[PDB]
């Protein structure tokens, strides 16, 4: 009686925002709360020195952005290397400290920003990275004490 | 069967046998003894965790909710948590005497006190506690840094003494200047509220009244002396009482071979 709801569990782990001319995502490029928090298997690029494919790393969680607060997401991520070396496996579930994204994310100072490819680094259960060196430019949103005190804070931010 | 020294019940007894802070914080004390437990069990006392070693001697005169956890323990832990040759070890509920009856119901005549002032040693410390009670001494006392009156070696030496068979024993405090010059004034002068004093059983002795008492006591002489020390210090002389009689022995005796000679007849029995 009253099939009140099916799946009901995506609504506990997704950032769903109605489209009603007031609640709406937008393409970014408008103001904080850019939009489109990147919710599906998105095959992010790895950047830090491991055998993570650096070109493919399939997504796990249904939310990724700082106006969605990557600062406390616990964003799981599955590794799917099309090739690693012919050291990680192509089948493990590491967390991720998202670095940047091609989606034009507007900052709270009007500074729009978008990079050539959405990238990230694999890390551990205690939020320590798995690599030694990082080969990309991370985003300001990686400054939290959440992903700092173990993150090398690789190099030049944006 | 517990063949692991990391078991909670094992680590329970260790921090109950050797540590002294987290003893009272749980109000428990380890007892070892095959017959020493029934002795206490006879007068209505049930061990919380009676750990028998896994073996032959399994008397069950209180079983079936003897405050259960009647655990069987390995030989290996029978060595570690149990310094003692018993296959029968447990722990009991700390009793307490009240620190006020030292201050108020100080009865006049038959009041002889013990003190035992030093950093002491178990076994000896426990032994005196058995014999001091063994003659119904009242107000057996602690000092600056004697060993806890519930230590596992002390209760092994006391052999059924610590619990109230007949023991109005007492324990004293810690004071400001890393000393106990305020341990006495709070009570000891008040333990001259009832009148006489002595300071025997010190390796060094002075006035030395020396076991020479003639009159049977003028039996109604309602004052009576008190206990003694262990080492050589004038700390017993800075207190207000002007009594100073530091007693010695007669023959070639040495440490610990002086008290049980003194306390034997220096106790209440001046009637003889």
């Amino acid at each position: 009686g009253n099939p009140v709801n099916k799946t009901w569990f995506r609504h506990n782990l997704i950032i769903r925002r109605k489209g009603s001319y007031r609640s709406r995502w937008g393409n970014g490029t408008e103001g904080y709360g850019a939009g489109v928090p990147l919710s599906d298997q998105v095959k992010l690029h790895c950047v830090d020195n491991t055998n993570c494919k650096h070109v493919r790393l399939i997504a796990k969680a249904t939310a990724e952005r700082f106006a969605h607060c990557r600062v406390f997401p616990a964003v799981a991520h599955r590794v799917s290397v099309q090739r690693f070396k012919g050291r990680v496996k192509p089948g493990n579930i590491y967390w991720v400290c998202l670095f940047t994204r091609r989606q034009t994310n507007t900052r709270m100072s009007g500074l729009q920003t978008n990079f050539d490819r959405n990238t990230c680094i694999i890390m551990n259960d205690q939020r320590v990275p798995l690599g030694t060196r990082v080969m990309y430019c991370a985003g300001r949103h990686v400054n939290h004490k959440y992903h700092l005190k173990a993150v090398v804070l690789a190099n030049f931010f944006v | 069967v517990i063949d692991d020294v990391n078991h909670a019940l094992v680590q329970h007894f260790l921090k109950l046998s050797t540590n002294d802070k987290y003893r009272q914080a749980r109000q428990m004390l380890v007892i070892g003894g095959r017959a020493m437990i029934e002795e206490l069990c006879r007068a209505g006392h049930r061990p919380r965790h009676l750990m028998v070693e896994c073996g032959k001697p399994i008397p069950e005169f209180l079983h079936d909710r003897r405050k259960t956890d009647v655990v069987l323990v390995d030989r290996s832990v029978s060595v570690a948590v149990t310094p003692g040759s018993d296959g029968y070890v447990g722990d009991f509920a700390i009793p307490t005497p009240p620190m006020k009856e030292k201050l108020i119901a100080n009865h006049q005549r038959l009041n002889r006190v013990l003190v035992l002032d030093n950093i002491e040693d178990p076994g000896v410390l426990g032994t005196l506690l058995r014999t001091a009670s063994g003659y119904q001494y009242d107000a057996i006392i602690a000092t600056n840094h004697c060993a806890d009156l519930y230590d596992h070696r002390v209760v092994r030496a006391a052999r059924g003494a610590h619990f109230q068979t007949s023991v109005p024993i007492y324990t004293l405090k810690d004071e400001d200047g890393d000393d106990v010059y305020g341990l006495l004034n709070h009570i000891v002068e008040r333990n001259n509220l009832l009148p006489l004093c002595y300071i025997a059983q010190a390796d060094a002795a002075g006035v030395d009244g020396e076991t020479a008492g003639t009159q049977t006591g003028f039996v109604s002489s309602p004052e009576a002396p008190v206990g003694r020390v262990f080492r050589s210090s004038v700390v017993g002389a800075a207190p207000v009482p002007l009594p100073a009689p530091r007693q010695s022995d007669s023959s070639y005796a040495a440490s610990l071979s002086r008290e049980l000679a003194s306390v034997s007849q220096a106790r209440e029995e001046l009637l003889s």
Binding site: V55, Q82, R83, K85, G86, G91 | -
Partner: protein, 300 residues
């Protein structure tokens, strides 16, 4: 939910006994590349006295040295053994059951009754196709059950499920050596870490999935053949520098029919199209004609 019998075989023993208590000659369909992984656990203590006709299929790809000892082993115990390339199909294996009883059958008391045959073995190594080939043709050309072959309901045409009771296939007629079914008792799915490798290696249980990726058997068929040669001749068959140093180069050296989206300047080939190749080709007995099991020279 169409799974199979699921449980340890060593509890299907005291029921297998009473199945042999009435049978006469025991059969089996094994894989000569797996002499004792495709066997039921009791093969040792199963019968010891009923005349077993133990058959090893796909023998042409199983090595010949290990073929002699395994042949003469049972041939010493008395229970026979027959090896077949399966190219010359089971039609000759059937001929065996026509011959391998006339010499060893006890004479029938009643001129025409049966030779009740108890068959065992993995259904996916040749036991199913051996039944349902002789079970289908009996519906047309008729020996017993004596009815007009019309009562087979809609959408069956074969019944290896939900009845399988007294169901049996009459392989022969005048020496009517009939054969039972033995509702499949093998490959319990509770198999061993390694047995699933040798099983999926032989093409049996060909499922390569999240439970058993190619790179787990391919790592096994490569590290089993540490002796590079006549196997590197399959590598050298595709331009390989003969000796492969390890798993990375040989699998990546054979990416000529493999690959994915890779740049014009740096190609990122696909090592899984090379995985299945190195895996499935060894199945065909193409790479090497070498067994997997160890062949205990002792009795076990």
């Amino acid at each position: 939910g169409a799974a199979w019998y699921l449980g340890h075989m060593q509890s299907a023993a005291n029921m297998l006994a009473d199945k042999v208590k009435d049978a006469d000659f025991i059969l089996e369909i094994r894989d000569a590349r797996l002499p004792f992984t495709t066997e039921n656990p009791n093969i040792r203590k199963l019968t010891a006295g009923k005349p077993r006709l133990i058959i090893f299929n796909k023998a042409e790809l199983s090595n010949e040295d290990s073929n002699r000892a395994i042949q003469e082993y049972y041939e010493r115990n008395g229970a026979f053994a027959l090896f077949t390339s399966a190219r010359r199909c089971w039609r000759d294996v059937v001929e065996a059951v026509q011959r391998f009883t006339t010499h060893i059958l006890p004479p029938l008391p009643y001129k025409t009754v049966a030779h009740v045959g108890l068959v065992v073995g993995m259904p996916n190594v040749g036991k199913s196709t051996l039944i349902n080939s002789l079970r289908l043709a009996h519906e047309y050309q008729f020996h017993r059950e004596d009815f007009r072959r019309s009562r087979s309901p809609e959408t069956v045409s074969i019944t290896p499920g939900t009845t399988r009771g007294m169901k049996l296939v009459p392989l022969s007629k005048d020496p009517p050596v009939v054969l039972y079914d033995t509702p499949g008792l093998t490959l319990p799915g509770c198999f061993t870490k390694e047995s699933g490798l040798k099983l999926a290696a032989c093409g049996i249980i060909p499922t390569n999935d999240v439970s058993l990726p190619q790179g787990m058997v391919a790592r096994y068929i490569y590290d089993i053949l540490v002796a590079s040669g006549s196997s590197e001749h399959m590598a050298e068959c595709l331009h390989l520098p003969r000796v492969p140093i390890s798993f990375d180069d040989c699998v990546a050296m054979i990416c000529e029919r493999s690959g994915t989206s890779g740049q014009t300047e740096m190609g990122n080939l696909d090592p899984v199209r090379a995985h299945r190749f190195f895996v499935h080709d060894f199945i065909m007995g193409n790479l090497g004609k070498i067994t997997l099991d160890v062949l205990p020279r002792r009795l076990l």
